[PDB]
Amino acid sequence: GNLGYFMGRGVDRNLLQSMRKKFVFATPTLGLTVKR
Amino acid sequence: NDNPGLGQSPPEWLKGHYQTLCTNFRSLAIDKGVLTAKEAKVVHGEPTCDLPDLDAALQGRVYGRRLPVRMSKVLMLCPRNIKIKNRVVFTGENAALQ
Amino acid sequence: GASGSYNETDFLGNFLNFIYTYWQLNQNLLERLSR
Amino acid sequence: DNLGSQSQPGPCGYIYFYPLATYPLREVATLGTGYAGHRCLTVPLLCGITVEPGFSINVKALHRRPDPNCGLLRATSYHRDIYVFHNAHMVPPIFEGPGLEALCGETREVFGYDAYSALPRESSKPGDFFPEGLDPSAYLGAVAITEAFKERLYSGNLVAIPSLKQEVAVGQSASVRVPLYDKEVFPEGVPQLRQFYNSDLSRCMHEALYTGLAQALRVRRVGKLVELLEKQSLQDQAKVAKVAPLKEFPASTISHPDSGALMIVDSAACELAVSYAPAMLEASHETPASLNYDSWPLFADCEGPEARVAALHRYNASLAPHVSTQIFATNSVLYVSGVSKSESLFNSFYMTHGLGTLQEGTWDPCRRPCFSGWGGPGTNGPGNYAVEHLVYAASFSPNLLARYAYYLQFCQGQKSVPETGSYVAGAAASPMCSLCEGRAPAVCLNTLFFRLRDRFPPVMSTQRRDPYVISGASGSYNETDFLGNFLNFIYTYWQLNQNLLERLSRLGIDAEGKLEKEPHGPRDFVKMFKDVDAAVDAEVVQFMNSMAKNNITYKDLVKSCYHVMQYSCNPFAQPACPIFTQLFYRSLLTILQDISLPICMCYENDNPGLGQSPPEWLKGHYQTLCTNFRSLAIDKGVLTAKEAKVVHGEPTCDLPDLDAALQGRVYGRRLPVRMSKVLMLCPRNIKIKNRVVFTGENAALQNSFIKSTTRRENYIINGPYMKFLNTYHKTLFPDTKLSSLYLWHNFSRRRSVPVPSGASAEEYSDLALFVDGGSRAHEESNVIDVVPGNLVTYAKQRLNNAILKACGQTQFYISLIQGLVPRTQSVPARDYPHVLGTRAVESAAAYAEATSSLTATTVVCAATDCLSQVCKARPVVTLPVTINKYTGVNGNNQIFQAGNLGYFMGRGVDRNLLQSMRKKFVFATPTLGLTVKRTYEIENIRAGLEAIISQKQEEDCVFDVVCNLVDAMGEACASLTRDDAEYLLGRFSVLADSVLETLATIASSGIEWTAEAARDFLEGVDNFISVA
Amino acid sequence: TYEIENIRAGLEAIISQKQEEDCVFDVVCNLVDAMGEACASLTRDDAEYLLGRFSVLADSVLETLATIASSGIEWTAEAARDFLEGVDNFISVA
DNA sequence: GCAGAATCGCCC
DNA sequence: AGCTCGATTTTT
Ligand SMILES: [Zn+2]
């Protein structure tokens, strides 16, 4: 399962223009729903 | 490719082949680099267990019985993870990418 | 969806994850930075 | 691309006709299965004696015309055996003993086996299948058949077309062939009597081919096995279950707590062997160089027919130990009794052996009574192996039994008894013999049986997990030097051994350890060894430097090394004997069953029997089980095979008009063609493994492997030099009365040595100290349990003891494999009564008189100390195997297999086996120099000069170059020109003027041209500043 | 056991005990006792098996049996001794 | 009585 | 528009 690219210009402004940089969206759960 | 369609519709072709194709999938999909899962047998220890008398409970009367019990299914397929990979180093070998 | 417990996402990924390990090397550096 | 795609269109088989006036009838009889009174026999397929040179063993067979304008093609190889059916009485028998056909018939009935049942038609008359004008009385007739259509030959469903005759040379003899086609090439039909049938041929195939395949599956109904193999070939039934109804089970399986699961696993293993073995046998095969009879090296010194027949008899004696091992061994493939259940989980089902089990009554797949059993019977007495057990081993076939008896006639007797001549004139001549009536007492099968009596195995009824014994040709790549497959690829261990043989060549020693110059005396004997020790110790350094600079983990790679042998899966690679057809086919069927056992167990654990009979359970499950087997049996550590697609290039091909040819008219047509099957499963090798290093981890085993260090008294006589000290005894101690053993044992206890009458004392004091020193150094360092017979084995032992020390392997002996190699010898015939023939014998005095002038050929086996040189000669092999099954590593859940080398059972097999964990045996006969064939001087002068100049340091080289030229050319140096000198000096051609100026001083000073005089003249006839 | 195992055991029992004398005549007498006239054609492959651990002795045994065969005495242990027993420098080492 | 092993190819 | 990779467990 190789990590790929997002399609569509509406997804996020940080994706608006590469081989050598890829992106993931992440939200943490420690300190929200699970205790440290 | 080994068992061609020969103008059959998919429901006709699956009638003969699908039971074999299930066993190929279980052998070739799991632990081969994306999906991991563990097979297990499920067992119950006691030959009877403490349960409500469902015939009395349907008529509004509540009391216990030690009903004889057994499993209707024994095999379980516990899923674990799907694995995502990304290569770190470009080695210069593919001359179109450099 | 939810992520699993064991992710390898430092700069060299799964390099020397088991056999000192790259995980131990990063723990050593954080201890020096604590001093 | 592949050998199947490349094969040409052709017929389903051929009838060959050979002229009786010129054909070599006594030669073919030595390779045949002829018994006295035969009407048919088998012979091998060979170019230049049974088929013409350039015979194609692979073909596309034209087998069906769906209509008169379309052909279908099946890709198939030929069957290995040829069946000789017309005028067969003209071929001599291989064995002279009478009465075998009735003995086979009686014994087949008591074991409950199916006899051949003839068709209601007569056999085809000669005028139906002979070419036009040939006389049937003048020719010998035989069939060659393709592996896919041999059941159609048996069942009378082929058509012969005499108008399509072809004239062919078979050795010297002007021969003819006629093609065979399946009756399905005639869609409008041909009359039932126009088809080809011979009842003696079909009966011969029933007994010599199909009955042994039925025995390998534990089936009694042979005719029903032939019918289901035919329909599997013609109607594509490979994924349909078919043998389960014919199965039968013993009381140990019926009484078992897991009996329902055992009956399903035993049945499914047999179904899979019947699906896959015919497919692999029909596949396209490579053509070996051993298939060409006129290039066989064994004939090279022969003059005339008698010398050629005597050379074939010596060839047969070299194969006999393979055949007699399969009779004498309790765990022979011929005595496999079925499947039983316990061992670890994947080993819990296993193959069993025992003749006692094979005599018992049985039950059918629905638990009803089936065969009722046999109570047993002779001269070997009650409960012991009898002549009926030998008839059972030979598949109740008089053809096979005759060739087994011929091989047993080479074996020595081993008494645990009347003298041979008082047995032959006495009880062998009794009118009570059911074979000879007493009228052929010296050759009778009961006389041969009486002679070999104490070598036959015991009769067993137990269910233990033992290895089974297999026979056949070896593959191309065997790894059987002392560390096996250690560093086979990446320098490699193969390259290291090639480097050592090159150093030993510079010392005057060849690859078999023969010297170009034998040692003259004590100094020369010490000098010979010190040079080999220095040459080995130099190569250890260059090797250890390579392992170091590359950071290779050689110290852990030693722990996991194995010996490896390849068992070949090509039927044409086997030796030219019809018994090896049965041994190969039964070895393959047994290995496919043993591989399938855990695959069937795991599928049945997921899909339980629930009181179903195996034929009911297989009806739903078998198609899925075929696909599991194909995925899990191949490339998992024992069996290798390659799948391929077969394609034909042209849309039409040049073929005869078969409708015109049936009416006698011959002309060509371009018939449209397509393949009837596309998939082919090409078999490659079965792989046998043995572990080299014991690591001390299993604490129960250590006492078998542990290395002692204390100073023994036997250290010289059990040391590395004793065989050489014996070989050279008459040169070391001229005319001494002492044995070499006593001389060196006296030295080992009294510290004294004898000095010959004119020889010098201190020279012998040095010889003694060399022997003492090296023997104590060997006692300390050695972990290879061998006393070496030749300088190559001595050198290779020294080398491998060095590598094991660098790996820290010092506490234990390593495992060894030893080869047992046949040696053929002529002996006085006194105890070998078969040399007298069918002769009547009237008294013991006449037996003694008639044998007094006669000799018999016999065979014994000798132990080699060096299996790897035997494996270079592409040997025929016999060995024991167990197939062990285990889980993968690193969390994997798949099953992997190893075929592990085991042990022989039964005290009659070979005297070298009579008493280990740490030594195992294989029987081997080489084929190079039997059936397969094995610079300018100015280049050698040039190489020897570049070898001097590249090494000479701290001295000027011109005198040592001039001496090498005067040695190699002598007086011819006196006119050596500059153009010749520059060529000989090679890279160093700048030296030429100084060489020629030096040679002129030898020429003009008037000394003779020899290296001794050159030094005596030259050696009779500076400022140096240092630079920054 | 086979009789060839018992001959082999009896020879290893002699050779492992015989001290301060050369053993070839006592081995040859035990063979002539156990095999008689059949010694006259004893091959090197048979002799090496019977000598067991001490198979190095085989050439000297066969050279000795040829002298009994060619001298025309009968094959018995009494005659073998009567022929053989009718038909040195030594430096010490540190 | 009589080890243990994830496997394929490559062939100098 | 957007590498190549025989795979599993181990688990800090
Ligand atoms: Zn008889």
CA distance D944 to D940: 6
Contacts 24+ apart (CB under 8 A), D892-896: D892/B31, D893/B31, D894/D632, D894/D636, D895/D346, D895/D598, D895/D599, D895/D602, D895/D632, D895/D636, D896/D636, D896/D637
CA distance B50 to B46: 10
Count of beta carbons in the 10 Å neighbourhood of residue D608? 12
Rg of chain D's alpha carbons, rounded to an integer?
34
- Which residues precede a break in chain E, with C-to-N distance above 2.5 Å? 87
Q: Which structural technique was applied?
A: cryo-EM
Number of H helices, E strands in chain C: 1, 0
D214, D314, D680 from D687: Cα distances, Å:
26, 31, 22
Indicate the residue of B20, B31, B75 with minimum beta-carbon distance to D623: B20
- Give the B:D interface size as CB pairs under 8 Å: 17
E71, E72, E75 from E79: Cα distances, Å:
11, 10, 7
Evaluate whether chains A and B are touching (3 or more beta carbon pairs less than 8 Å apart): yes
Burial of D374: CB neighbours in 10 Å, binned 0-12, 13-18, 19+: middle
Which residue in the block uniquely carries the two structure tokens 């690219």? A5
The reply to whether the CB atom of residue C15 sits less than 7 A from any atom in nucleic acid chain G is no
With distances taken from each CA to the C1' atom of nucleotide G7, the closest residue turns out to be B32
What residues have CB less than 8 Å from D814, skipping those under 6 apart? D482, D692, D693, D694, D783, D784, D804, D918
What residues have CB less than 8 Å from D179, skipping those under 6 apart? D10, D11, D12, D13, D14, D160, D161, D164
Which nucleotide is nearest, taking the CA of residue D705 and each C1'? Answer: F3
Q: D974: which DSSP letter?
A: G
* CA triple D877-D883-D884, angle to 5 deg: 140
Name the phi and psi angles at D1027, rounded to 5. Answer: -125, 140
Query: Å from D606 (CA) to G11 (C1')?
Result: 32
Indicate the residue of A1, A19, A20 with minimum beta-carbon distance to B85: A1
Q: D977: which DSSP letter?
A: -
B70, B72, D385 from B42: Cα distances, Å:
11, 10, 53
Distance of CA A29 to the CA centre of its chain: 16
Q: Closest approach of chain B CAs to the CA of A11, in angstroms? A: 21
Contact E44, E62 (CB under 8 A): yes
CA distance D921 to D562: 15
Query: Å from D710 (CA) to F4 (C1')?
Result: 31
Q: How remote is the CA of residue D95 from the centroid of ligand 1, in Å?
A: 14
Q: Which residues surround ligand 1, an ion (CB under 5 A)?
A: D 433, 435-436, 444, 446
Chain G bases near protein CB atoms (7 A cut-off): 1-12
Give resolution in angstroms. 7.8
Q: How remote is the CA of residue D839 from the centroid of ligand 1, in Å?
A: 12
Angle between helices D445-452 and D398-408 (to 10 degrees): 50
β-strand pairing of D919-925 with D816-828? parallel
What is the spatial order of strands in the sheet that D70-77 belongs to? Answer: D9-10, D58-67, D70-77, D668-675, D652-656
Q: Which residues pair with D349 in a beta bridge?
A: D341
CA distance E93 to D317: 51
- Which residues precede a break in chain A, with C-to-N distance above 2.5 Å? 17
The reply to whether the CB atom of residue C11 sits less than 7 A from any atom in nucleic acid chain G is no
Q: How remote is the CA of residue D97 from the centroid of ligand 1, in Å?
A: 8
Quick check: D627 and B19 CB within 8 A? no
Q: What is the maximal distance between C-alpha atoms in chain B?
A: 82
Quick check: B20 and D631 CB within 8 A? no
CA distance D936 to D534: 31
Mutation target among D627, D636, D643, D890 for the B interface, most CBs of B within 10 A: D627
What residues have CB less than 8 Å from D189, skipping those under 6 apart? none
Q: How remote is the CA of residue D102 from the centroid of ligand 1, in Å?
A: 13
Query: Å from D637 (CA) to F9 (C1')?
Result: 13
Mutation target among D911, D913, D915 for the E interface, most CBs of E within 10 A: D911
Which nucleotide is nearest, taking the CA of residue C7 and each C1'? Answer: G11
Residues of chain C with C-beta less than 8 angstroms from the C-beta of B86: 13
Q: D991: which DSSP letter?
A: G
End-to-end CA distance of chain A: 31
Indicate the residue of E4, E43, E88 with minimum beta-carbon distance to D825: E43
Query: Å from D916 (CA) to F1 (C1')?
Result: 10
D274, D278, D1002 from D75: Cα distances, Å:
19, 13, 76
* CA triple D512-D773-D502, angle to 5 deg: 30
